[PDB]
Design a protein around this ligand. Sequence first.
Ligand SMILES: Nc1ncnc2c([C@@H]3O[C@H](CO)[C@@H](O)[C@H]3O)n[nH]c12
Ligand SMILES: Nc1ncnc2c([C@@H]3O[C@H](CO)[C@@H](O)[C@H]3O)n[nH]c12
Ligand SMILES: Nc1ncnc2c([C@@H]3O[C@H](CO)[C@@H](O)[C@H]3O)n[nH]c12
Lengths: 268, 268, 268
Amino acid sequence: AVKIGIIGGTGLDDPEILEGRTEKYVDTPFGKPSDALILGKIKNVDCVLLARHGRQHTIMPSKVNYQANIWALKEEGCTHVIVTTACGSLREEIQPGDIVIIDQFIDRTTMRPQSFYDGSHSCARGVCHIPMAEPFCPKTREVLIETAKKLGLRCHSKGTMVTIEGPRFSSRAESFMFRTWGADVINMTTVPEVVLAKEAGICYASIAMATDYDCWAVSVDRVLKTLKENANKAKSLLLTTIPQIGSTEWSETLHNLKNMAQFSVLLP
Amino acid sequence: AVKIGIIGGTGLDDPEILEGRTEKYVDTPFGKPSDALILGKIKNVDCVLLARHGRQHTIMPSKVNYQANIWALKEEGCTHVIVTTACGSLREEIQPGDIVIIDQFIDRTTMRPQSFYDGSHSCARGVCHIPMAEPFCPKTREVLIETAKKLGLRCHSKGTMVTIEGPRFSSRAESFMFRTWGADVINMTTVPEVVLAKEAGICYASIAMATDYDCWAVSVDRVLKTLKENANKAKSLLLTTIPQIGSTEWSETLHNLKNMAQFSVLLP
Amino acid sequence: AVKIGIIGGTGLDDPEILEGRTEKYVDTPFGKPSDALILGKIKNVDCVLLARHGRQHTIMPSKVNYQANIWALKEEGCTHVIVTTACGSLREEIQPGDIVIIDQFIDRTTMRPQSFYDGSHSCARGVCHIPMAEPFCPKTREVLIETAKKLGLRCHSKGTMVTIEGPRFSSRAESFMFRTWGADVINMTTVPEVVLAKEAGICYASIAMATDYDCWAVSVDRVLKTLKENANKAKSLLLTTIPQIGSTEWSETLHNLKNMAQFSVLLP
Ligand SMILES: Nc1ncnc2c([C@@H]3O[C@H](CO)[C@@H](O)[C@H]3O)n[nH]c12
Ligand SMILES: Nc1ncnc2c([C@@H]3O[C@H](CO)[C@@H](O)[C@H]3O)n[nH]c12
Ligand SMILES: Nc1ncnc2c([C@@H]3O[C@H](CO)[C@@H](O)[C@H]3O)n[nH]c12
């Protein structure tokens, strides 16, 4: 049995995606999640939807409580967490409207807690050095890629996301630099979301939707405009991918993730 | 009508630059500015001078209240903000004593608020994603460049400033690395000063004075020594540039900046 | 007369290394050190041992009070500070088990105070811009290198340490990137430890022990396993190096360090 947590990004968090919906506000040892959890289903698969920036989008990337969001989904029983995020393209071949099933990231954030084990919560004691060689779940990414193919969607099978602190967009000099570092797309929320999901032993995958070419011309209006035009893609991908995940066995994948997380903790 | 805000850097904030001076201490929703605002004129142009590190230079780069400084200048009616800053040269052709009218930056700071919209001030509500493709005002930079030419000063027409957190200087390994990233000069205060000026809809330009070659030998004494020897250059440049700015029309430039800033804000 | 402060890293802080031991808990203007100071000797040389993460290793890298640790050693009279640290190798020639007498660093940390002069302690007033061209003491590194040679140990004479914030390990994309930046080894504690030692006018050197190849496969268990197998090397190196340091004259070296630190401070 699996339960899919879904974190929706800017203009990519439509509750209508789930049937038999029920709102549920929760609390965690790390504070309150961005907004209430929406419990529902996609076919016969249990899901939990959460708006990363709050349903009215009032939380900037730097201020999102990533710890609470991941902890709440974990506490709810989620075995998987698939998210959506807008991003700028740092590669000509990645055109706005394209989906990128990212497999790597480059951290450029500075003021964000990246671990549950901060030595101040009973629920998570000790020091945790979580491995990040493969930040995203390969099995989940695989089904997303195949499903995108079945839907005839322009989709890139891999990509490195550079996550900046924000809220400002990058300067042109930074944009060029990120390209030399091997970054393919850029956003403000992948890190530490992917890191905390790992510590929680959750299969995490990200559906990145290119909304602009950054500036190597990006603006809020341009991003919102592209998201509005392409939101249906991520929705369709999730609706078709989730039932597939629910039809396969994950016991082993989840076991290996649990072990990796457990053995990354150093106790007193 | 224009009003020029001038933020003076280390040993580059001489109040004598303005005539008909008047001291004015102010407060802002983000706290107190580094020091009192000095109101005065350069020819027929109204100006507002502010010492970035306080008149006695007691504030380290990491601790400068960039938000309050920019907000105070904005509240005072400034349409432009031209600043001075010492910096290390990362390029052989940029010799100590040379002026660099920077046009780009690379952020390496880590503990600095970079937006007025931090969701805790009525004066600035919502989330702001300010564009940084062109961080500095091209029209202002243009007049600075031409004026430097008329003054016969060694001046570089462009350059990328890498702003480090400090207060320590860079290691040699970092110095070499910055060069590979395309950085031309290095300092500790350009970011987030330039970013906040943008959010405020202000035309911002920076007069960077190379004071050393970093270490790709830099020391406090070396920087102070070079600044003392070349301070007159920035003063003369400002005195000659400002009247020129006041003689041209900026209504359109300021309108486009206001629009960019306004449309970068996402309301609830 | 010299006094060697020794900061022991993960599984590299054996108090048995000193004879005539005496435990001593202290306080500093910056708070409490990671654990009690252990006073003792190695031959005829006075030493002070301190466990970076606490004797039970309960402090994550981001939370170590580097200021208090360095200040306590300084207050105790230490002229030198030699430390041990595990690290990942970013170079094929640097094999796990190898020692690296690092000479440079690249900062990737984000939430760490890096100066004693934060404008809130009487003991350190003003603004300090400490030079970092040569972060590590060349004379101390020289004796460590020669001693390693006399012990027949695989030892690299130089290397650039990239210090990440942690507590998570790097992603593969970050690992590759660090290699392009010229980094040779990677850890989570060199910065700001080396910076604060410099401000304190202390000769600082680091004995880096490669424990893995990062991921360009690293895990907590792998690191602990390698450290357990090679801990004896760092211990032997320290035991043999320290008496040599005590047999030479450092008055001039220490004088130049004191001057550099003193002249890096800007008073009101
Ligand atoms: N070129 C770009 N650079 C950085 N972030 C973004 C984004 C993402 O969309 C939002 C900003 O418009 C924010 O959540 C960020 O993660 N779209 N395009 C971007
Ligand atoms: N090589 C260098 N690296 C970093 N900052 C500076 C500076 C600037 O001058 C001051 C330090 O001396 C500080 O305000 C910083 O922005 N001059 N030379 C520098
Ligand atoms: N590949 C690697 N990356 C980052 N840090 C480390 C370390 C160091 O060892 C500890 C983590 O296992 C921590 O103190 C860190 O500084 N070993 N291997 C590492």
